[PDB]
Design an enzyme around this catalytic site. Sequence first.
Site, PDB file in Angstrom:
ATOM      1  N   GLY A  10      90.475 -58.911 -38.571  1.00  6.81           N
ATOM      2  CA  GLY A  10      90.162 -60.234 -37.994  1.00  6.81           C
ATOM      3  C   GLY A  10      90.079 -61.277 -39.115  1.00  6.81           C
ATOM      4  CG  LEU A  12      84.139 -62.095 -42.230  1.00  5.87           C
ATOM      5  CD1 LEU A  12      84.085 -63.135 -43.392  1.00  5.87           C
ATOM      6  CD2 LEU A  12      82.774 -62.031 -41.537  1.00  5.87           C
ATOM      7  CG  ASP A  42      88.082 -48.590 -28.871  1.00  2.72           C
ATOM      8  OD1 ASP A  42      86.997 -49.232 -29.002  1.00  2.72           O
ATOM      9  OD2 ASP A  42      88.759 -48.634 -27.802  1.00  2.72           O
ATOM     10  CB  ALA A  66      82.637 -59.367 -32.381  1.00  6.87           C
ATOM     11  CB  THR A  68      85.391 -63.601 -31.332  1.00  7.66           C
ATOM     12  OG1 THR A  68      86.809 -63.572 -31.480  1.00  7.66           O
ATOM     13  CG2 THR A  68      84.765 -62.575 -32.290  1.00  7.66           C
ATOM     14  CE1 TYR A 130      81.281 -63.691 -29.796  1.00  9.05           C
ATOM     15  CE2 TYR A 130      80.173 -65.813 -30.069  1.00  9.05           C
ATOM     16  CZ  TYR A 130      80.792 -64.716 -30.623  1.00  9.05           C
ATOM     17  OH  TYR A 130      80.970 -64.623 -31.983  1.00  9.05           O
ATOM     18  CE  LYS A 134      78.346 -61.217 -32.811  1.00  4.09           C
ATOM     19  NZ  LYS A 134      78.904 -60.207 -33.749  1.00  4.09           N
TER      20      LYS A 134
HETATM   21  N1  NDP Z   1      85.126 -66.512 -34.823  1.00  3.80           N
HETATM   22  C1  NDP Z   1      84.081 -67.334 -34.753  1.00  3.80           C
HETATM   23  O1  NDP Z   1      84.238 -68.691 -34.406  1.00  3.80           O
HETATM   24  C2  NDP Z   1      82.707 -66.817 -35.029  1.00  3.80           C
HETATM   25  C3  NDP Z   1      82.514 -65.447 -35.142  1.00  3.80           C
HETATM   26  N2  NDP Z   1      81.279 -64.915 -35.398  1.00  3.80           N
HETATM   27  C4  NDP Z   1      81.202 -63.483 -35.709  1.00  3.80           C
HETATM   28  O2  NDP Z   1      81.848 -63.200 -36.953  1.00  3.80           O
HETATM   29  C5  NDP Z   1      82.472 -61.939 -36.895  1.00  3.80           C
HETATM   30  C6  NDP Z   1      83.936 -62.114 -37.279  1.00  3.80           C
HETATM   31  O3  NDP Z   1      84.605 -63.003 -36.391  1.00  3.80           O
HETATM   32  P1  NDP Z   1      86.172 -63.283 -36.556  1.00  3.80           P
HETATM   33  O4  NDP Z   1      86.672 -62.743 -37.801  1.00  3.80           O
HETATM   34  O5  NDP Z   1      86.377 -64.704 -36.195  1.00  3.80           O
HETATM   35  O6  NDP Z   1      86.708 -62.508 -35.236  1.00  3.80           O
HETATM   36  P2  NDP Z   1      88.229 -62.031 -34.935  1.00  3.80           P
HETATM   37  O7  NDP Z   1      88.386 -62.295 -33.496  1.00  3.80           O
HETATM   38  O8  NDP Z   1      89.273 -62.656 -35.781  1.00  3.80           O
HETATM   39  O9  NDP Z   1      88.202 -60.483 -35.251  1.00  3.80           O
HETATM   40  C7  NDP Z   1      87.606 -59.571 -34.346  1.00  3.80           C
HETATM   41  C8  NDP Z   1      87.732 -58.219 -35.000  1.00  3.80           C
HETATM   42  O10 NDP Z   1      87.012 -57.286 -34.190  1.00  3.80           O
HETATM   43  C9  NDP Z   1      87.861 -56.156 -34.060  1.00  3.80           C
HETATM   44  N3  NDP Z   1      87.547 -55.456 -32.811  1.00  3.80           N
HETATM   45  C10 NDP Z   1      87.365 -56.009 -31.579  1.00  3.80           C
HETATM   46  N4  NDP Z   1      87.117 -55.004 -30.692  1.00  3.80           N
HETATM   47  C11 NDP Z   1      87.149 -53.843 -31.368  1.00  3.80           C
HETATM   48  C12 NDP Z   1      86.982 -52.511 -30.970  1.00  3.80           C
HETATM   49  N5  NDP Z   1      86.838 -52.200 -29.652  1.00  3.80           N
HETATM   50  N6  NDP Z   1      87.110 -51.554 -31.940  1.00  3.80           N
HETATM   51  C13 NDP Z   1      87.372 -51.836 -33.275  1.00  3.80           C
HETATM   52  N7  NDP Z   1      87.550 -53.145 -33.652  1.00  3.80           N
HETATM   53  C14 NDP Z   1      87.444 -54.109 -32.707  1.00  3.80           C
HETATM   54  C15 NDP Z   1      89.278 -56.711 -34.039  1.00  3.80           C
HETATM   55  O11 NDP Z   1      90.215 -55.749 -34.419  1.00  3.80           O
HETATM   56  P3  NDP Z   1      91.749 -55.717 -33.788  1.00  3.80           P
HETATM   57  O12 NDP Z   1      92.264 -57.113 -33.690  1.00  3.80           O
HETATM   58  O13 NDP Z   1      92.460 -54.878 -34.771  1.00  3.80           O
HETATM   59  O14 NDP Z   1      91.723 -55.096 -32.367  1.00  3.80           O
HETATM   60  C16 NDP Z   1      89.170 -57.754 -35.159  1.00  3.80           C
HETATM   61  O15 NDP Z   1      89.303 -57.139 -36.412  1.00  3.80           O
HETATM   62  C17 NDP Z   1      82.244 -61.410 -35.482  1.00  3.80           C
HETATM   63  O16 NDP Z   1      81.069 -60.650 -35.583  1.00  3.80           O
HETATM   64  C18 NDP Z   1      81.987 -62.652 -34.664  1.00  3.80           C
HETATM   65  O17 NDP Z   1      81.232 -62.339 -33.506  1.00  3.80           O
HETATM   66  C19 NDP Z   1      80.154 -65.703 -35.531  1.00  3.80           C
HETATM   67  C20 NDP Z   1      80.211 -67.098 -35.418  1.00  3.80           C
HETATM   68  C21 NDP Z   1      81.539 -67.775 -35.172  1.00  3.80           C
END
Ligand code: NDP
Length: 273
Positions: A10, A12, A42, A66, A68, A130, A134
């Site tokens: 993702g 971050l 997963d 997450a 998101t 959401y 969280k």
């Molecule tokens: N994005 C935002 O505006 C904000 C985010 N946050 C928090 O920061 C963190 C990072 O966010 P961000 O990088 O934007 O999010 P992204 O949406 O870019 O990334 C989400 C990540 O979670 C992984 N993921 C989701 N479901 C699963 C699952 N079932 N099993 C394994 N991996 C999973 C995805 O992997 P894949 O794609 O490979 O499936 C991806 O790597 C999260 O905790 C988010 O809640 C907090 C404040 C703001």
Amino acid sequence: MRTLITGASGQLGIELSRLLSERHEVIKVYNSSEIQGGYKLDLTDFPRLEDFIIKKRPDVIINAAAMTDVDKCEIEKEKAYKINAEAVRHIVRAGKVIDSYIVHISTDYVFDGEKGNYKEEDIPNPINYYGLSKLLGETFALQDDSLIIRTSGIFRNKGFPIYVYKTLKEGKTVFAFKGYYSPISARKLASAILELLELRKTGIIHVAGERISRFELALKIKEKFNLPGEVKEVDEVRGWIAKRPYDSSLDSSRARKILSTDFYTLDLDGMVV
Ligand SMILES: NC(=O)C1=CN([C@@H]2O[C@H](COP(=O)(O)OP(=O)(O)OC[C@H]3O[C@@H](n4cnc5c(N)ncnc54)[C@H](OP(=O)(O)O)[C@@H]3O)[C@@H](O)[C@H]2O)C=CC1
């Protein structure tokens, strides 16, 4: 086996991987989105998750995974719960077996947005699922020796600044929610987290950007790149299912003292295309 990064694929996670790999043995986990040298897992397959942690023996786990998509979380509450909350219970449990240092990433949407400038000890009261899912994950993550990092508006290849850039570039209208938060680039957030790691901080810590309205942010990026297309501020965005907090900005004063790096000044260069 230095560091497990869930959500490695993702916004971050990509940036964490880049920076941590300098010092720093990294185990990168993805699910749907394959990354170079990663492991597919997963996190909602709880026995497989716990086994993975116990086998790989990370010294440190950074839980960035997450669901998101805020509007999707509002409809698919069961799915949001399992990944945003319940997986955390299992990360903590397996982590404990190996005495891992657990760093869990959380959100400004745990707050109701009626006050703004939220500090660590302010009481969460989310107004969308959401945020609630969280917040439940935060609750599982609460441990004497774990760290919860709350952040806001992470942007890299998605998030609001990207939606603005792409929309305005094509001459389309951006509808900017009337409200505040504290957007941080994924790269600046990753750099902060790296500093925090070395320190073995525990408890809760806010690490996010300067308070800004979506409207001003959108117009700054319009001005920055002489983009066409209009910015219209709206009280409510049409199409949104979930309610957004009015002012979810975070007070990151504690982290500003602890950390050397300026993680907070708006970083538009952190946008990816
Ligand atoms: N994005 C935002 O505006 C904000 C985010 N946050 C928090 O920061 C963190 C990072 O966010 P961000 O990088 O934007 O999010 P992204 O949406 O870019 O990334 C989400 C990540 O979670 C992984 N993921 C989701 N479901 C699963 C699952 N079932 N099993 C394994 N991996 C999973 C995805 O992997 P894949 O794609 O490979 O499936 C991806 O790597 C999260 O905790 C988010 O809640 C907090 C404040 C703001």
